[PDB]
Amino acid sequence: TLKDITRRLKSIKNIQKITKSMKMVAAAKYASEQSARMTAMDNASKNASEMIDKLTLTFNRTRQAVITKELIEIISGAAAL
């Protein structure tokens, strides 16, 4: 569903930029544990980004499906006359 896809994609964007902020903060505090936090949050941000790309593919697919379905409804309602 287009709207539920936007919901999940916004959730993942939220936590993605959250780990981005926390990574850059832990990189500030890098001037052992802080370096590990920096790299772990970098990996988490890259994971969330690849999930965002997957969800973008799915979203484009669902958007095309919705447009096609609404066109079919319109033309089949008009062609019954």
């Binding site: 993942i12 936590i15 780990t19 772990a40 990996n43 988490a44 994971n47 999930m51």
Partner: peptide
């Protein structure tokens, strides 16, 4: 699944 996927 999603937590395991992102935050390891």
């Amino acid at each position: 699944q999603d937590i395991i996927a992102i935050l390891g």
